[PDB]
Design a protein around this nucleic acid. Structure first.
Ligand SMILES: [Mg+2]
Ligand SMILES: [Zn+2]
Ligand SMILES: [Zn+2]
Lengths: 99, 76, 149, 246, 1331
RNA sequence: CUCGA
DNA sequence: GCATCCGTGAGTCGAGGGTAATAAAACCTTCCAGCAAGGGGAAGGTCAAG
DNA sequence: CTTGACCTTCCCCTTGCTGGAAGGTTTATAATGGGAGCTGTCACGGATGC
């Protein structure tokens, strides 16, 4: 009960909820942070991690991010993007059978 | 000498002497009680000093002479 | 409502859990400003129930950003309701559509410098007709502790 | 209701707001045509003759809505909710082209260019050029001005350093950081710099003398060493490094 | 006081500070909250708890002023003394101070001459050390092991004495002699002859001399008495909820006291050695966990799993007392609100809310309410403000008027970032600002906030009216251009008011004056655009002081007549008769300021803002979707590019072209296809065909609503209209490579799905670049201010007769910086004269201003010698005449202005904005310099030297073009020939570096052996080859010593002469020396023998003076060059002078490029390799005037390319601040090779070798230092300790006994005193003189 | 830590 | 002398939230307070005549 | 201005204990070497160690 209440209530990922909209409530839960334990920080991240990789198409949105110091680190999950059973990001497509 | 201080600084010579001279003169009317020379026309004691300077009535030599004569008058 | 939307206003209002959606379908039996009583249709009932769902709307409360939360009903007395409809629009909803701000007349012209560098000049009929007046709810607390004296 | 500024478009290239303005003007033109046809109280077969003509004006539109299967009472409830303006959907990268906006503006008797001839309010003359007028969905924002304004004369000094606190809810003064100390050194205003270090912030026998001088009616500086310097002396002297004055 | 001294602390000094020995680790009691006896908070030692009360309460009530109670020992005084009384702890064993141990250098092994790796085996109880050995088998400080001590104890008995621990190092420092080792090192320093040791022995000698000069003793490095901070700087305060809240020094102190008491108990139990040796180690660990936590081993953690903040973590970084609580404080009488625009104001006014000025001016309101008798006391005057009565808002209007108030906006980049306005009173909650000062603040009204600071006194209230008022700052201190240049809306109004249509509703009429042109416009009878004939009366004041009127009929519009009721008297009508874009308005305001003064310019800049807002509102300039016009020939160009790319694609699908050719062909056929559309949309936008007075078709410049915002310079350029009609050019993926297919769709037609995803790489790159650029651009400004903080104008003139020489930059093509603004403002050094070399036109020292500089522009002068800041002769500040012109006001600078803060803010502010053949261009004459040349075989000229540069002169004298030309080029012309624009004058190969023989005679292939010294290669295609030699590493390693010297001789064999001198000519062989023309051939001059083949961090690299990775080396002295020893990776070369000292050698690695060969001559300071040069070698070999000219022509190519104008004088200030420490090479006054100031080594020769004795000699050499290092080597150590490395700066200045003096103006900000610049500088002389 | 310039 | 190893830097100004975890037992000693209802007295403050 | 009579609060005192606080001293089967935390920055300058 110390460890569980420490995580739910003092971590860098258990943050306060923005509740001044129906929109701002729903886009705070589909937010993919990259900071926290076992990750980066805001003083040791260059131009390479904050860039739009060409495999971001359809999984993580390119034009929905903060613009402060953590510009590329706080990402945002796309519309149709699901999470795999392992944890990777899959996105739907339609099959093309003989044209 | 309310909007700009271009008329006053061309008599004393530089801004850092104008500030010290006007700050010396503006305290003789605050607590010393000496009367101003220019008509007041509803102004604080700063702009009256900055207007006394720009009409040639207050300088550093005049402010030294005008108090040394009154210290000699206090000696008598 | 927004006059020019993208059709995605309908999905964000329902799935955000801020409106009151009907689990079963039927006819509305009684509408108050606090509760809504709905009579279930016949085929959408379970064989050991009484067949009335009662929704209790939440009136003026406090959010985390100290703004209002208030659910008004949007149906009338005695009208049919299907499954998955929107019975009570929340704070920024309007007949189940997400609606954050209000729309008004806009002209693009420089007017005597009062809109100089991304400034906005607002007419008085925006102030008069209560278009942008929000409601904030604060919370003040006075705690009487025990001193040694 | 709002007079915005037109010099913000070419420097930033957000030409979405001009098209949203024209489409909002078309939507409210249709919504005022329906309001005029309801205020005359004409028929119900006239509303089905017009609202049906308003609901198919694309080229290959996805939705197909016909008001033949609508009963003669549901059309009145539908046109009662379109009195404030016909709502228009425009998906993200499947948008409405520039020909469709002109084909929609001609339905409600509006100018094709989207710009009208505005008259002035004060002088009563009319402007030379036509002026763009339409509808833009304006939001409010949480950065209200009642929660930003703050002022403080005196109160609630800190414990160790004896310089005032920080925060609007804490009732503290703003920070005169070294970016401003350089800017006051560059002006040469040394008397404003001597005041904003000792007698305003950090002295203990300096503030309560300046307050009596100001209330008494005599603006006279009374200096003294800051309290943050002879805490630095005690924290250097505790390292076994003898530091003094002369 | 006037000086701060700092030194080591004896235990007698710490006992003299102390008030009582702390003995127990207890802090307070748990039931009552009282301090305990002999604790860390004790009332006996540190003073009472409440005012004038003891602990027991036996004495109170101020009657007992200074008695001491007999029960509790508490001295009855104020509780204020708990912040000033210290205590001490008597350590049961000596322990080492961590600052004097583990700083770098070690400072305790620097004295003992022992490594730190050997000292730490003795501080930890791991290995013994020998203090003294009676039998000299064991030397001094010879470290024994644990088991070797058992052999040495039995072999000698008790003849030696070895110890282990901190007392061993204490008895080692105690038993040394400084006066033996000082003279021993001073005699062996001038016996040995080396460079690698004399840079260390000088430091040890200077440390040993500084110890006996400061008066310290080396035993005080080891603590024996540890002092305790007063108990009100580490407090223990109860919070609201009953939980206490302590600082963390009460944990480290409690650990020291606990382990010290346990060591006192263990030494009386007669414990074994494994326990006491561990306990002393733990006491030492607990001491240096208090002094500086994370240095010894693992950092000490508290209960939060966080490192505890020690004493050294309280003065360093961005959270110390220095950088957060001393240089910048939190101030009273302050405010904060959202800013809003209001155009009804004047230039010196600002809005203010009522509910803000009621709170800022509260004691002034009390002082005014008590004077008028409206309230009898302050406690009855506060209620009149709490009720907000009627008489308060009429007293506030008397308090506020003629009382200025500052307005700061963060970040305060430059000097104009804080200004003082005259307040008015508006209702609401937003500071209303004037719309013209937003260019200085860089404030956009989109939620910005500004801070409001009030001046209190009567001196500060006069420093906001005459020094910081906004009507005084209308010129930038960066450059003489105005800073109240009008912004977007007013310049669009002024552009729309001054235009002309063709028909325009009543053109061609004639008018009387401008006052009958407003009456025509207002009634509607004539449009704002027209073409009329009005009759104006302009005033020209070329009569000296007097204004001459003159009247003439001008052909102009109506709007240019209706504007001319605003322009003041002295200006002419040719300033409003143009189209009046953005540059013309600032040019008009600059002309008005230079001609007429300051008092008309403020009124003019206010009326321009009042008029530009009005006549832009009457127009109506709206953007519609019909304004962005697609060019009708757009789909054709894109279809043609799609046709032309398929040809290269099908040529790649078969085998005709490679991939790297196709990838460049596609880019080269898309770039021209993009420009063919960018031309078409702009040629469609700017032309509108209107009906003339007849039925005609005349075209004019257009009245499109989006072209007028681009043409007038209000908002946007032509690069952003291309993204609205033409195509988006070529996006780039973040690898850096350009994507092949472009974004063929613009923002009107709307992008695609993939074209919008491709367009996000560039936007995210440019948006994540600004978040990481501003950190470096705000760190460079901090590093720049803290170097040039103390450079104030001190004297008025010194006679120095020297200074750098100006020249317009002439690189590559046209001139980029003309002489008219480069020399402007500085005084002259020597009396420069007309090109007819007499008739001195300007005297020796006159201020080159306007009406003097265009007089130079009329004549053909080209190089004026000016005084400069890098050559001033005064001490601790520069002259007024050696500086130049105060760029803000416009006169000579006044004695008292701090220069270097203005220069540092002016450089560091726009850093966030930063990120073959010779073909002449025109017709002129040709000049060359330092040229040796012979004619060729065909009748043209060749060049046989390195320093030659082709300089095109014009017909009058100024160099229009300056072209480099390498060694061994074959010209087409001769020296001094008339040329034609576009002709080729030099022809030489880009890839090879030939070695053309100058001698007109036969050749012979002498001194070459094929196989052992050289190689052989036959031309497999032609056959015209000869005897070649291989490269450095590829050749035979048997004959690298036998130099193949092709000695050219005639058919007889006689040594042919060099042209003009007796010595014979040879042509030696480096690697790749492939000769072509065969043996025994006759050649002339001009005949080839061989052809051997081959942003902002730049500013931060220049000012740090970092040596680059591949430095272009230079020759030290003049002489002839031959290679000496052989290649052990690096073969030497000697520089043997013809007239000097032979044996100077050097060491060249990496044999890529050798611009000199093994028989050619050099000078001092030329090229040997190629590439970038280090700024140290420019100072060492060339003069000081070649470093301060290298930087201001290199950092001025970063700001110029980006389009940022910065005057060149602001860079020479910090270049003067760099080369400030100067090392001596001779002696006679102080020492041999120590690095002193150049200011102290100049005052010595101004005292010693004039009248005391003869030239005893103090000849020095200047030294260049980076800006991170020229501030950590100043005199006043407080100006260095607040910058960086507070531990090293405070440690280095505590064993030396350094004495501060409070010279600069960053130590007077700390101690709360008047800075010695500005208004404080006049007062400071009355303190300096009477002392 | 999230947000604003 | 030169590859390698370690120390010290890395923009400013404002909002809001916060302010926690758990660990022997029997024996002895001295000293102080309190409690069932007052009594006693000492160092200061008022009253009513004279 | 004077004298005795009355007031005030406050500190100490009366038995037959009892309750509590703060400190010190032992206890005997056999127990014999810790564990938490760090890895996703870059660029120098300059000690240092064969
Ligand atoms: Mg802004
Ligand atoms: Zn006492
Ligand atoms: Zn000089």
């Amino acid at each position: 009960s110390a460890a569980v209440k420490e995580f739910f209530g003092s971590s860098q990922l258990s943050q306060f909820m923005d509740q001044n909209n129906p929109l701002s409530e729903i886009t705070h839960k589909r937010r993919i942070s990259a900071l926290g334990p076992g990750g980066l920080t805001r003083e040791r991240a260059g131009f390479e991690v904050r860039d739009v990789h060409p495999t971001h198409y359809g999984r993580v949105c390119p034009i929905e991010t903060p613009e402060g110091p953590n510009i590329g680190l706080i990402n945002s999950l796309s519309v149709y993007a699901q999470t795999n059973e392992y944890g990777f990001l899959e996105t739907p497509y339609r099959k093309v059978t003989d044209g | 000498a309310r909007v700009t201080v271009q008329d006053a600084v061309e008599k004393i010579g530089n801004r850092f002497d104008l500030v010290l001279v006007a700050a010396r003169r503006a305290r003789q009317m605050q607590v010393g009680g000496k009367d101003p020379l220019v008509p007041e026309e509803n102004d604080k004691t700063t702009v009256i000093a900055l207007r006394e300077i720009e009409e040639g009535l207050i300088n550093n030599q005049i402010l030294d002479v005008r108090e040394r004569q009154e210290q000699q008058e206090q000696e008598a | 409502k927004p006059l020019v939307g993208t059709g995605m206003e309908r999905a964000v209002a329902v799935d955000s859990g801020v409106t009151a959606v009907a689990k079963r379908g039927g006819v509305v039996q009684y509408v108050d400003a606090s509760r809504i009583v709905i009579k279930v249709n016949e085929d959408e009932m379970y064989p050991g129930e009484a067949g009335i769902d009662i929704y209790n709307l939440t009136k003026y409360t406090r959010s985390n950003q100290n703004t209002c939360i208030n659910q008004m009903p949007c149906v009338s007395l005695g009208e049919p309701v299907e499954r998955g409809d929107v019975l009570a629009d929340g704070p920024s909803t309007d007949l189940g559509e997400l609606a954050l701000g209000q729309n008004m007349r806009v002209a693009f012209m420089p007017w005597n410098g009062y809109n100089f560098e991304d400034s906005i000049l607002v007419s008085e009929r925006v102030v008069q007709e209560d278009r942008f007046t929000t409601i904030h709810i604060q919370e003040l607390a006075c705690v009487s502790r025990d001193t040694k004296l | 209701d709002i007079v915005l500024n037109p010099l913000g478009v070419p420097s930033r290239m957000n030409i979405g707001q001009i098209l949203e303005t024209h489409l909002g003007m078309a939507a409210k033109g249709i919504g005022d045509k329906i309001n005029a046809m309801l205020k005359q109280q004409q028929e119900v077969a006239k509303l089905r003759e017009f609202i049906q003509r308003a609901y198919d004006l694309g080229a290959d539109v996805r939705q197909k809505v016909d008001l033949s299967t609508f009963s003669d009472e549901e059309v009145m409830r539908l046109a009662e909710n379109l009195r404030k303006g016909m709502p228009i959907a425009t998906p993200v990268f499947d948008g409405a082209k520039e020909a469709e906006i002109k084909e929609l503006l001609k339905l409600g008797d509006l100018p094709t260019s989207g710009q009208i001839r505005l008259y002035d309010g004060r002088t009563g003359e009319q402007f030379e050029r036509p002026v763009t007028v339409g509808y833009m969905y304006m939001l409010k924002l949480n950065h209200l001005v009642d929660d930003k304004m703050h002022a403080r004369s005196t109160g609630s000094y800190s414990l160790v350093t004896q310089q005032p606190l920080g925060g609007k809810a804490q009732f503290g003064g703003q920070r005169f950081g070294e970016m401003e100390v350089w800017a006051l050194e560059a002006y040469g205003a040394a008397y404003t710099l001597q005041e904003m270090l000792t007698v305003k912030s950090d002295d203990v026998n300096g503030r309560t003398k300046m307050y009596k001088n100001i209330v008494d009616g005599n603006h006279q500086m009374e200096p003294g060493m800051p309290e943050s310097f002879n805490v630095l002396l005690k924290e250097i002297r505790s390292l076994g490094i003898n530091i003094e004055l002369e | 006081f006037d000086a701060i001294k700092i030194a080591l602390a004896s235990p007698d000094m710490i006992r003299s500070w102390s008030f009582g020995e702390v003995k127990k680790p207890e802090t307070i009691n748990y039931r009552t909250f009282k301090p305990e006896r002999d604790g860390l908070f004790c009332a006996r030692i540190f003073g009472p708890v409440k005012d004038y009360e003891c602990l027991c309460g036996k004495y109170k009530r101020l009657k007992h002023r200074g008695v001491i109670c007999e029960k509790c020992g508490v001295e009855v005084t104020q509780t204020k003394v708990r912040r000033e009384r210290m205590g001490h702890i008597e350590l049961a064993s000596p322990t080492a101070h961590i600052w004097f141990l583990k700083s770098l250098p070690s400072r305790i092994g620097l004295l003992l001459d022992m490594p730190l790796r050997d000292i730490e085996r003795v501080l930890y109880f791991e290995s013994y050390v020998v203090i003294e050995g009676g039998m000299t088998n064991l030397e001094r400080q010879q470290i024994l092991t644990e088991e070797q001590y058992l052999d040495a104890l039995e072999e000698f008995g008790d003849e030696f004495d070895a110890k282990m621990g901190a007392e061993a190092i204490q008895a080692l420092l105690k038993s040394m002699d400084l006066e033996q080792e000082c003279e021993q090192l001073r005699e062996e320093l001038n016996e040995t002859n080396s460079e690698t040791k004399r840079k260390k022995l000088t430091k040890r000698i200077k440390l040993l001399e500084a110890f006996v000069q400061s008066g310290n003793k080396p035993e005080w490095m080891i603590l024996t008495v540890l002092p305790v901070l007063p108990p009100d700087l580490r407090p223990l305060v109860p919070l609201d909820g009953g939980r206490f809240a302590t600082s963390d020094l009460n944990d480290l102190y409690r650990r020291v006291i606990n382990r010290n008491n346990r060591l006192k108990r263990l030494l009386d139990l007669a414990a074994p050695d494994i326990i006491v040796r561990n306990e002393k180690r733990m006491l030492q660990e607990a001491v240096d966990a208090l002094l500086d936590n994370g240095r010894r081993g693992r950092a000490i953690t508290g209960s939060n799993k966080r490192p505890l903040k020690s004493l050294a973590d309280m003065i360093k970084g961005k959270q110390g007392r220095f950088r957060q609580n001393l240089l910048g404080k939190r101030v009273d009488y302050s405010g904060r609100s959202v800013i809003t625009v209001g155009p009804y104001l004047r230039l010196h006014q600002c809005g203010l809310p009522k509910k803000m000025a009621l709170e800022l001016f509260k004691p002034f309101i009390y002082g005014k309410l008590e004077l008028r008798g409206l309230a009898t006391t302050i406690k009855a005057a506060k209620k009149m403000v709490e009720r907000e009565e009627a008489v308060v808002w009429d007293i506030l209007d008397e308090v506020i008027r003629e009382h200025p108030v500052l307005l700061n906006r963060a970040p305060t980049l430059h000097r104009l970032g804080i200004q003082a306005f005259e307040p008015v009173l508006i209702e609401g909650k937003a500071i209303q600002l004037h719309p013209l000062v937003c260019a200085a603040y860089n404030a956009d009204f989109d939620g910005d906030q500004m801070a409001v600071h009030v001046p209190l006194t009567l001196e500060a209230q006069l420093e906001a009216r005459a020094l910081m008022m906004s009507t005084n700052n209308i010129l930038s201190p960066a450059n003489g251009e105005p800073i109240i240049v009008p912004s977007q809306d007013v310049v669009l109004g002024l552009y729309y008011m001054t235009r002309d249509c063709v028909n325009a509703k009543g053109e061609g009429m004639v008018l009387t004056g401008p006052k009958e042109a407003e009456r025509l416009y207002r009634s509607g009878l004539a449009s704002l655009h027209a073409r009329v004939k009005v009759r104006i009366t302009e005033y020209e004041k070329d009569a000296n002081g007097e204004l001459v009127a003159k009247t003439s009929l001008k052909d102009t519009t109506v709007g240019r007549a209706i504007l001319w009721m605003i322009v003041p008297k002295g200006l002419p009508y040719s300033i409003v008769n143009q189209a009046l874009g953005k540059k013309a308005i600032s040019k008009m305001l600059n002309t008005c300021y230079r001609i007429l003064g300051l008092k008309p310019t403020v009124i003019f800049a206010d009326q321009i803002m009042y008029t530009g807002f009005a006549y832009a509102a009457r127009s109506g300039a709206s953007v519609g979707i019909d304004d962005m016009v697609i060019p009708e020939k757009k789909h054709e160009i894109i279809s043609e590019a799609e046709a032309e790319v398929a040809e290269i694609q099908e040529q790649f699908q078969s085998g005709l072209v490679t991939a790297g050719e196709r990838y460049n062909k596609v880019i080269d056929i898309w770039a021209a296809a993009n420009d063919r559309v960018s031309k078409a949309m702009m040629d469609n936008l700017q032309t509108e065909t209107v009906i003339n007075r007849d039925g005609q078709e005349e075209k004019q410049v257009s009245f499109n609503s989006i072209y007028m915002m681009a043409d007038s310079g209000a908002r946007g350029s032509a690069a952003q209209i291309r993204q609205l009609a033409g195509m988006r050019g070529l996006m780039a993926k973040p690898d850096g490579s350009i994507i092949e297919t472009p974004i063929t769709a613009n923002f009107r037609e709307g992008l695609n799905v993939l074209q919008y995803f491709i367009s996000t790489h560039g936007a995210r790159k440019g948006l994540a670049d600004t978040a990481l650029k501003t950190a470096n651009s705000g760190y460079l400004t901090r590093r720049l201010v803290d170097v040039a903080q103390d450079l104030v104008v001190t004297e008025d003139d010194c006679g120095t007769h020297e200074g750098i020489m100006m020249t317009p930059v002439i690189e590559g093509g046209d001139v980029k910086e003309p002489l008219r603004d480069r020399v402007l403002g500085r005084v002259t050094a020597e009396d420069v004269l007309k090109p007819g070399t007499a008739d001195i036109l300007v005297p020796r020292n006159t201020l080159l201003h306007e009406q003097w500089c265009d007089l130079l522009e009329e004549n053909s002068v080209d190089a004026v010698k000016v005084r400069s800041v890098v050559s001033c002769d005064t001490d601790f500040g520069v002259c007024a005449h050696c500086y130049g012109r105060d760029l803000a006001r416009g006169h000579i600078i006044n004695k008292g202005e701090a220069i270097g803060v203005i220069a540092a803010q002016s450089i560091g502010e726009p850093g966030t904005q930063l990120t073959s053949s010779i073909q002449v261009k025109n017709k002129g004459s040709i000049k060359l310099s330092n040229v040796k040349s012979v004619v060729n075989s065909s009748g043209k000229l060749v060049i046989t030297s390195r320093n030659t540069e082709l300089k095109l002169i014009d017909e009058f004298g100024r160099t229009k073009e300056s072209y480099k030309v390498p060694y061994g080029a074959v010209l087409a012309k001769g020296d001094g020939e008339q040329v034609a624009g576009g002709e080729t004058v030099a022809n030489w190969d880009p890839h090879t570096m030939p070695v053309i023989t100058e001698v007109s005679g036969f050749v012979r292939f002498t001194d070459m052996i094929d196989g052992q010294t050289i190689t052989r290669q036959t031309d497999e295609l032609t056959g015209l080859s000869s005897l070649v030699v291989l490269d450095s590493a590829e050749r035979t390693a048997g004959g690298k010593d036998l130099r193949p010297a092709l000695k050219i001789v005639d058919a007889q064999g006689n040594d042919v002469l060099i042209p003009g001198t007796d010595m014979p000519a040879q042509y030696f062989l480096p690697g790749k020396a492939i000769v072509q023309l065969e043996d025994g051939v006759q050649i002339s001059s001009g005949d080839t023998l061989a052809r051997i083949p081959q942003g902002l961090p730049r500013v931060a690299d220049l000012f740090e003076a970092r040596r680059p990775k591949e430095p272009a080396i230079l020759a030290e002295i003049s002489g002839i060059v031959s290679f000496g020893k052989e290649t052990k990776g690096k073969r030497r070369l000697v520089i043997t002078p013809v007239d000097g000292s032979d044996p100077y050698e050097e060491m060249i690695p990496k044999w890529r490029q050798l611009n000199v060969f093994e028989g050619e001559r050099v000078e001092r300071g030329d090229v040997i390799s190629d590439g970038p040069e280090a700024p140290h070698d420019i100072l060492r070999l060339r003069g000081v005037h070649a470093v301060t000219r290298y930087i201001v022509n290199e950092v001025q190519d970063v700001y110029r390319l980006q389009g940022v104008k910065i005057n060149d004088k602001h860079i020479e200030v910090i270049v003067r601040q760099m080369l400030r420490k100067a090392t001596i090479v001779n002696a006679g006054s102080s020492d041999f090779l120590e690095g002193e100031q150049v200011e102290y080594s100049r005052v010595k020769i101004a005292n010693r070798e004039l009248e005391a004795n003869g030239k005893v000699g103090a000849t020095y050499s200047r030294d260049l230092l980076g800006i991170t290092k020229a501030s950590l080597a100043t005199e006043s150590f407080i100006s260095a300790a607040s910058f960086q490395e507070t531990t090293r700066v405070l440690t280095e200045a505590a064993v030396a006994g350094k004495r501060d003096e409070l010279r600069g103006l960053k130590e007077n900000v700390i101690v709360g005193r008047l800075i010695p610049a500005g208004t404080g500088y006049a007062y400071h002389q009355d303190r300096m003189r009477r002392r």
